[PDB]
Design a protein around this ligand. Structure first.
Ligand SMILES: OC[C@H]1NC[C@H](O)[C@@H](O)[C@H]1O
Ligand SMILES: OC[C@H]1NC[C@H](O)[C@@H](O)[C@H]1O
Ligand code: NA
Lengths: 539, 539
């Protein structure tokens, strides 16, 4: 089988797996599930979820517990169990940084500051975050990572592991950069030529060329170089796609670097990361903002002609499930909810308060829409035109439920009109437009009021000028001409519900009558439709 | 087996099936269930309901997807599966009109307006409703319908299919008639002689003879002729009963034609339809009005010496179930709730908000009263005297629950009296009268307060001068002399609960004592009674 690879062309991207585009319908374990005994608490969630790919840590501490004495017993069990369950793997290399810190590095690393130095604050105090200028640290991380890749090269010939995450949420909390003498010497020196060339800047020292951004851009650059070197060394052994994941700053109201994780691939340093680390395939957002506007903004910032969108982590509470739709609609290669196992942990308030079948089912229900067409969607999402939307009002707050209750009948009617309008999305599909609305009956035209809780969305792919592939969830999708018809009329020509078998469309039934009079109405159950529109002459 | 046929005699009617009267205890699928793959979501509901007859579409688009290339693969599967389940079929020919529009006509029909022309408004705009004056449209519909009938002639010798509906809810929304030049020419001309003779009118042009009703009567007449020609051609192949179903106007407050579907068999044009389409066996109301008075009025309007009553569609929400009783009481030949399948659709607000076992059970419970005596009831309903009533107050409406709560103890007592009186119905059964009351204990005489929700009803057939067949549901039925007795007394002589086996009555037990002291009290469980009354001398 050909190696997995990330392709980028015409500003679009595909994760190739076994020689064709692939979508990661993912799940990630909790942080302490990377042991053989924990896997029995992982697989059942994955099965219930319908996930095709598991993201799970492989820790430097577990593979090199004593320097030079490697142990791949976990990776062995993991590969074998994944294959038995017919799922793929993304391994998360928890090493120099996990959430800014070295807790997953071996004891002989994290307890030897002299050999493996920490970031020093401007005031001289030390933080528990390893400096990217530590050359011994880099050499050691690199050597262990290379051994892991050698294990895969020798023992995973069919590429059960399809991607590797290098480190986990790199950066530093509590300072902007390393201010140690070692780091200060490099900061005071000239900005490297390659970076100056790539950003088309005037040469100089860090402070000269970057000014108020020098400290942060420096930390970002040095971390990016470190991760790039690890990535290169591993890829020289087996050239799997590799990526880094970002502890995000709020894109609207970030606060200061150091409050957020300074030096990671935050939106303001993506240009530094892309220049510094050309061997890292993509930079992936970790999404735990619950609210639609902020999530939408993150998706927009991380989807670029030079950056495939991969939602490497997202919260596992109910409101997050619907963000699958815009993720895929942006041409995303994957989506991976965090903490999908029964090892007695919840990261509430980030995720679900309780982990149970209902938690899982919120994601299972949206995965069921994509699984039946995964390869076909993946191809259209690289080579063609796709769209995806989610229900754009968050669930109504208690504060808003009180403001609603004390309103004035004229204010209530007006608020309902405003909500209806906000819950109506328009998409330009070329000759045809779609309108997506949320939370209304399947019959007649009473205006949308939203689902409770917010949960809906829709996917659309263009198959031809007048033909679209459509599936949606707790929503209505309606089609109309994109531009005025010169005395013509229009209608739905045909809607077929069906499936793909061996890449061929098989029709199950035609939607007509009630099922197409009031748009195309979807509940929680999966239906995949091919919709053919027609304008026709009446002259 | 003899062909099914609709008999009419002495102002009464019977649907003959296999040589004897038959009652359709029906169910109708949702509009997009007319495919082999959907049938697995249809049969279980039918079984749970206890229905004996399934109404399901056969679409022109599916049988003639390319002109001249016929495909009966769906009809084949459907016939075979129906027979395996030992049920009968009513096929619904979705063709030139389905709900006023051509969406179920093939693409080569509906997208070719030049060949198959649409209704043109008085202002020159075109509506998506095919004109009944289109001669190509008629020929093409007729040809396909004839092929369907040929399929049944050759492949359904035992008449699994017992009746065919020609079109579905014909007419036009948004205009009263076709105002195209083609139509305007026929409108300006003389009203056809046969119509002038049949309605005993003075000859003239449409506007002269009909005045303010000309536009609507013209559309009705032209549609009726079209449907009659299709019907005749099909019957020449196999002479099954055939009917049309009506998108009803509100009989008390109709609004204007075009707001309602103009040209269909609405109550104000039944005379036009009966004169124009003598080959169509009956005109069937589609009932979605929820309230007792309006439903009752519809049943009254559509039950005529020249029109067998068939409730071809009724809403599937709980309040509609009880209308089975007055339907059968009027000598109706059948009753068919709409949307009885699990294909992920509800026509709420017309039907039930959620489709589940409870939805089905509301109809199952009333069908269980009739199924055990279906052939016996059908014969009595043609040859004899039958009666049927439903609970005449709709379920109490929130607004009324508030008005009741803020009343004055004298106003509450008075309201309760008024309700009790409204919930008491009197029936003249010849020598004996019955009084039916709803929502009271099975013992003693506390006045009726109604069921919650409204749900009760009763069926009575006369077996002899003093003997009646009775079954009822969430109601009390009491008998008394119809005439003052000349110094005689009366009593129940005997009440037997039982069943029919090979057309013979088999007694299970005698109701007496508590069971007959306070009338005949019925809950949700089925009991079929023979009630013999007696007057006796005490002189
Ligand atoms: O549960 C919080 C979550 N935050 C993001 C990190 O990448 C994850 O490992 C985890 O710590
Ligand atoms: O669900 C509404 C119902 N209205 C009446 C039509 O005859 C049916 O086919 C269906 O459209
Ligand atoms: Na456009």
């Amino acid at each position: 089988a050909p190696l997995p690879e990330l392709l980028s062309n015409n500003g679009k991207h595909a994760l190739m797996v076994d020689g064709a585009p692939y979508i990661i319908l993912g799940s990630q374990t909790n942080n302490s599930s990377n042991y053989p005994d924990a896997l029995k608490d992982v697989w059942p969630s994955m099965e219930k979820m319908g996930a095709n790919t598991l993201s799970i840590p492989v820790a430097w501490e577990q593979i090199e517990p004593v320097e030079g004495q490697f142990d791949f017993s976990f990776v062995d069990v993991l590969l074998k169990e994944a294959r038995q369950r017919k799922v793929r793997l993304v391994l998360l290399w928890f090493a120099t940084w996990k959430n800014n810190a070295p807790h997953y590095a071996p004891a002989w690393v994290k307890l030897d500051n002299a050999r493996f130095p920490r970031v020093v604050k401007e005031d001289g105090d030390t933080l528990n975050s390893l400096s990217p200028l530590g050359q011994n640290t880099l050499a050691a991380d690199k050597k262990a990572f290379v051994e892991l890749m050698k294990y895969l090269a020798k023992r995973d010939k069919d590429h059960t592991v399809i991607m590797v995450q290098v480190q986990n949420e790199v950066g530093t909390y509590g300072a902007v950069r390393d201010y140690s003498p070692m780091a200060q010497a490099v900061f005071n020196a000239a900005v490297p030529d390659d970076l100056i060339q790539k950003l088309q800047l005037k040469p100089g020292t860090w402070s000269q060329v970057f000014g108020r951004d020098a400290d942060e851009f420096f930390h970002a650059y040095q971390i990016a170089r470190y991760c790039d070197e690890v990535t290169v060394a591993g890829k020289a052994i087996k050239n799997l796609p590799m990526y880094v994941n970002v502890a995000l700053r709020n894109p609207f109201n970030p606060g200061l670097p150091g409050q957020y994780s300074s030096g990671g691939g935050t939106d303001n340093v993506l240009h530094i990361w892309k220049a510094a680390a050309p061997n890292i395939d993509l930079i992936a957002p970790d999404i735990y903002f619950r609210d639609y506007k902020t999530v939408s903004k993150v998706l927009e910032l991380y989807t670029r002609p030079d950056n495939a969108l991969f939602v490497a982590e997202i919260g596992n509470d109910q409101p997050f499930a619907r963000y699958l739709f815009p993720t895929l609609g942006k041409g995303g290669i994957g989506f991976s909810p965090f903490g999908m196992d029964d090892t007695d942990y919840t990261n509430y308030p980030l995720g679900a308060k309780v982990y149970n079948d209902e938690t899982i089912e919120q994601f299972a229900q949206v995965y069921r829409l994509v699984n039946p067409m995964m390869r076909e969607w993946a191809r259209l999402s690289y080579q063609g035109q796709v769209w995806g939307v989610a229900e754009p009002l968050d669930s109504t707050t208690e504060t808003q439920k009180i403001w609603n209750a004390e309103a004035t009948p004229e204010e209530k009617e007006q608020h309902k009109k405003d909500r209806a309008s906000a819950l109506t999305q328009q998409l330009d599909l070329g000759l045809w437009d779609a309108e997506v609305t949320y939370g209304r009956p399947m019959f007649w035209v009473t205006p949308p009021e939203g689902n409770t809780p917010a949960a809906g969305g829709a996917l659309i792919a263009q198959l031809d000028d007048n033909e679209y592939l459509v599936t949606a969830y707790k929503a209505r999708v309606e089609f109309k001409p994109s531009q005025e018809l010169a005395g013509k009329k229009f209608m739905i020509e045909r809607v077929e519900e069906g499936r793909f078998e061996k890449g061929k469309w098989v029709m199950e039934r035609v939607w007509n009558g009630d099922q197409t009079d009031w748009g195309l109405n979807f509940t929680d159950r999966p239906h995949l439709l091919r919709v053919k529109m027609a304008s026709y002459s009446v002259q």
